[PDB]
Design a protein around this ligand. Structure first.
Ligand code: MG
Length: 99
DNA sequence: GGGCTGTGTTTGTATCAAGTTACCTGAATGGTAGGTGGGGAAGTCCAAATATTCCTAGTAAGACAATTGCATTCAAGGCCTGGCTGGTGAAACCTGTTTCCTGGGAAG
């Protein structure tokens, strides 16, 4: 067990999966902060909410990727309509028990 | 002559600290190798200190004049002291919450 946890596999994973598109908009949002960018107006982080139906991006810049900076960023966007599913990454701000 | 407040002397216990230690880790030491910093010796040049006089300006002084400063008296106001009332500050009790509090940890 000194040689099992250092050598890496020479066996690639198989074919990638293409999951199907949803059949309506407002079904899957794919959200991920970008940044730290170069600063402007006291902003560094930009929430990016892509619709999984189309590609229709939504931008909601914030000061710092906290939980509450995301929550008010979607209250603008939940004013439009309500999604069923929101995908993300396992972010520092999304995995919080508050969010 | 008397009085008031400060002061002192003695006791008990609670609290605070003194005590000794157990460990356990943090840190404190020992032995070494390396390079670097600094310390030391030198020199041409550099800046200040002196010896001088000279002249001049203001320093020093003597006189005078008048204001100010001082010392006293006057007048009363302001503040200190105390007899009193009560509203809050503090000490003891209880806690939930909040924040930290480094510390570790995950994830983008
Ligand atoms: Mg990301």
């Amino acid at each position: 067990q000194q040689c099992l946890i250092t050598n890496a596999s020479n066996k690639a994973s198989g074919p990638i999966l293409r999951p199907d598109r949803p059949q309506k908009p407002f079904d899957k949002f794919f959200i991920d902060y970008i940044g730290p960018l170069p600063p402007s107006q006291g902003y560094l982080y930009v929430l990016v909410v892509v619709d999984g139906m189309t590609g229709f991006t939504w931008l909601y810049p914030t000061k710092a990727p906290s939980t509450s900076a995301t929550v008010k960023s979607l209250n603008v966007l939940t004013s439009i309509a309500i999604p069923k599913v929101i995908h993300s990454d396992q972010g520092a701000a999304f995995t919080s028990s508050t969010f």
